[PDB]
């Protein structure tokens, strides 16, 4: 019933011979929402990443400062604000 991986005999690490787990890590450059780059050590092999949604473009972190895309594409000739004002009578609710 319980799904498991059944254990083999464990390998005897002798006292003194235990070595610390130094995992393989690459120096990875993260460019945030704006052009601020930051280096971080990372286990996945990718020298450069650029981020879209970060603290540097979130309103909570700076208060002082593709369905939608598809819709935009196929209702482009009409150009869909003025449109909002036209189609927003707040009597009926």
């Amino acid at each position: 019933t319980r799904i498991t991986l059944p254990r083999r005999p464990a390998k005897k690490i002798q006292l003194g011979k235990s070595r610390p787990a130094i995992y393989h890590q690459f120096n990875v450059k993260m460019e945030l929402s704006d052009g601020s780059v930051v280096i971080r050590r990372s286990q996945y092999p990718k020298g450069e990443i650029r981020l879209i949604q970060d603290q540097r473009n979130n309103p909570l972190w700076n208060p002082s400062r593709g369905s939608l895309d598809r819709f935009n594409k196929r209702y482009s000739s009409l150009f869909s604000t003025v449109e909002l004002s036209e189609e927003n009578k707040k009597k009926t609710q």
Binding site: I22, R41, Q43, I49, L51
Partner: protein
């Protein structure tokens, strides 16, 4: 065995005999783990920690300035009360337990140049409850944790037994990892910048959250973990994903000080404070 009577004999000298050194059994183990000759050696101070540097430069002075209360004396905690000797039965009696609590509470000191609050340790407890059925889920959770941290996780086992929740005793179920120093700092920085902003309706950490003494916590859902760059870069490799608790341990005397410190490192706080 002729007897079970344990009784350490007194000595006639003040030299402290380290018994480990007198043996020739574990020659690699006589070296400190910091020493290069030990197999346990690891390069510790590999690069300049950024969050720590920031804390040192900007925040620590600001925190000290905030926490200055003029001629603030020590506030003693709840302690074990002694008996008044108004009866001969008080004479070898154990002390009365503390007033409200059963356990003793620590003294709250005034903040000075020495005891300014700072980050002490992060612990990332992930207990996957579906792993009562599937042991492999615990392994996957541990891997995820390792990926996130760059630090070796430790397996959590079911310490208790209960029938209502289908839970046995002594069953591997998720994992934990205590981050300290530079890796912890990095993890915090990632949380602040990458992950927590990608959470949709994220107000912040609750102000009602925390220990009574310098410890604050919160948790991430399985939805939130896919924003970590190590997990995000291979969504094919990560079909399942597990939530986690994140216990931040500060060197703060009280919890409001700890909250203030965390705010200094760009953690938002939303709820009504105690």
């Amino acid at each position: 065995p002729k007897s079970a009577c344990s009784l350490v004999k007194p000595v006639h000298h003040l030299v402290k005999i380290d018994k480990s050194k007198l043996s020739p059994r574990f020659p690699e183990l006589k070296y400190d783990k910091s020493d290069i000759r030990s197999p346990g050696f690891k390069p510790k101070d590999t690069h300049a920690d950024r969050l720590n540097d920031h804390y040192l430069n900007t925040l620590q002075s600001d925190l000290l300035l905030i926490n200055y209360s003029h001629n603030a004396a020590v506030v003693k905690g709840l302690k074990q009360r002694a008996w008044s000797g108004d009866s001969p039965y008080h004479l070898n009696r154990p002390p009365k337990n503390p007033r409200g609590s059963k356990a003793q509470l620590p003294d709250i000191h005034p903040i000075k140049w020495s005891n300014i609050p700072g980050l002490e340790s992060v612990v990332i407890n992930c207990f996957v409850r579906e792993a009562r059925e599937n042991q492999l889920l615990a392994i996957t959770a541990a891997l995820q944790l390792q990926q996130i941290t760059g630090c070796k996780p430790h397996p959590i086992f079911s310490k208790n037994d209960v029938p209502t929740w289908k839970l046995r005793k002594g069953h591997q179920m998720g994992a934990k990892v205590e981050l300290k120093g530079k890796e912890m700092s990095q993890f915090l920085s990632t949380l602040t910048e990458i992950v927590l902003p990608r959470i949709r309706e994220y107000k912040g950490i609750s102000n009602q959250s925390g220990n009574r003494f310098g410890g604050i916590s919160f948790g991430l859902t399985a939805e939130d973990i896919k924003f970590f760059p190590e997990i995000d870069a291979n969504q094919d490799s990560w079909p399942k994903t597990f939530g986690m608790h994140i216990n931040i341990n500060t060197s703060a005397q009280l919890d409001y000080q700890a909250r203030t410190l965390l705010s200094g490192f760009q953690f938002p706080f939303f709820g009504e404070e105690k």
